[PDB]
Paper text:
The selective capture and retrieval of ER luminal proteins is controlled by the KDEL receptor (KDELR), which recognizes a specific ER-retrieval signal sequence (ERS) Lys-Asp-Glu-Leu (KDEL) at the C terminus of cargo proteins. Crystal structures of the chicken KDELR revealed a seven transmembrane (TM) spanning integral membrane protein with structural homology to the PQ-loop superfamily of membrane transporters. In the mildly acidic environment of the Golgi, KDEL-containing ER luminal proteins bind the receptor with high affinity, which elicits a signal for the integration of receptor-cargo complexes into COPI vesicles. In contrast, the neutral pH of the ER results in cargo release and the subsequent relocation of the empty receptor back to the Golgi, resetting the retrieval cycle.
Given that the stability of the hydrogen bonding network largely determines the solvation free energy, we attempted to investigate if the phenylalanine variant at the −1 position would disrupt the water network. Though the hydrogen bond between the waters and the His12 or the C terminus is equally strong for HDEL and HDEF ERS sequences, the hydrogen bond between the two waters is much less stable in HDEF compared with HDEL. The W1 and W2 water molecules are observed in the binding site, consistent with our previous HDEL structure and computational analysis. In both structures, the space available for the two waters is very tight. Thus, a slight perturbation of the protein might compress the space and disrupt the inter-water hydrogen bond network. A leucine at the −1 position of the ERS, however, would have more flexibility to maintain the water network compared to a terminal phenylalanine, which, being more rigid, would not provide sufficient flexibility and thus result in a less stable water network. Supporting this hypothesis, the temperature factors, or B factors, of the terminal leucine in the HDEL structure are 51.3 vs. 38.2 Å2 for the HDEF structure, demonstrating that phenylalanine is held more rigidly. Additionally, the affinity for TAEHDEF is lower than for TAEHDEL (23 μM vs. 18 μM), consistent with these observations. In summary, it seems likely that the increased affinity observed for the TAEHDEL peptide over the TAEHDEF peptide is due to the increased flexibility of the leucine side chain that enables more optimal coordination of the water molecules with the carboxy-terminus of the peptide within the receptor and explains the reduced ability of the HDEF ERS to retain proteins in the cell-based retrieval assay. The −1 phenylalanine KDEF and HDEF variants were retained more efficiently than the alanine variants but less efficiently than when leucine is present, consistent with our PMF calculations.
Numbering used by the authors:
A (entry chain A): 1 to 210
B (entry chain B): 2 to 7
The structure:
Amino acid sequence: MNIFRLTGDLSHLAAIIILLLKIWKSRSCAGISGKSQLLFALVFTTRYLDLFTSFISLYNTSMKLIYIACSYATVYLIYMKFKATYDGNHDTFRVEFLIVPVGGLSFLVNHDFSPLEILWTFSIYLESVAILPQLFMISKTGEAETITTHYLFFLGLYRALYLVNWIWRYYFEGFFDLIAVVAGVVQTVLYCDFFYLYVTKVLKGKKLSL
Amino acid sequence: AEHDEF
Ligand SMILES: CCCCCCCC/C=C\CCCCCCCC(=O)OC[C@H](O)CO
Ligand SMILES: CCCCCCCC/C=C\CCCCCCCC(=O)OC[C@H](O)CO
Ligand SMILES: CCCCCCCC/C=C\CCCCCCCC(=O)OC[C@H](O)CO
Ligand SMILES: CCCCCCCC/C=C\CCCCCCCC(=O)OC[C@H](O)CO
């Protein structure tokens, strides 16, 4: 446990609440990729099966349950409650090009050939590309609302802080996980265009055009 | 290997 990990967990929970409250208060999920929310829910489901085999801490258990709860709730608001404002015509990313290959790669490239480890690996590879449908939707529609960009900033910053956390844990604890690291780098580089546009445009009162 | 992060 270090400040980079804690700030990364707070940044991830901030992003999840920003999106959930934006949809709930506005009674609309316009411009939100439902597909990326299905992918994030699927990451939490496959990663957190260890809730049944391990107890690390009350913080670890609580955060996992909150993430599963908010990811499933976000999916429910998009596809059931406010489905009248879900823009299916613009959320056209073919997620089978992500799930089928990521699934195949988790079975072949992992730390152990056992069901719980293969499922954890799937969650790591899938998370690295889970935001692709949302970024693809923004480029298609042309615009991204300010609150949508704050959601994307805090979501992108979370795994960037986890990379710093892995440098810290490697130096001080001798801990190293190459699958999480390489996937974490892939996950963060996919935000590079967004980060540049958020800092130079959004933080200066301008339009984010992907 | 044990997974201690989110
Ligand atoms: C209205 C929509 C926006 C409302 C939401 C605003 C509040 C969420 C902000 C921050 C969460 C904390 C984590 C993100 C901030 C980290 C900034 C930074 O550079 O962190 C480096 C880190 O501190 C090195 O330890
Ligand atoms: C619509 C697009 C769909 C296609 C999406 C394709 C996947 C994501 C694309 C590029 C990631 C490439 C950069 C990843 C490089 C990771 C390797 C890495 O981390 O190398 C350094 C070392 O391992 C640690 O310091
Ligand atoms: C364009 C569609 C395809 C998208 C593909 C995106 C790139 C991510 C893929 C592979 C890893 C990237 C390179 C990182 C390789 C690091 C290998 C390494 O360090 O191996 C050490 C050794 O295996 C002891 O563990
Ligand atoms: C559009 C379709 C493609 C999109 C989907 C892309 C999925 C993300 C890719 C790579 C994750 C980076 C990690 C994979 C590289 C593993 C590096 C490694 O060390 O592998 C050996 C392992 O350590 C033995 O235990």
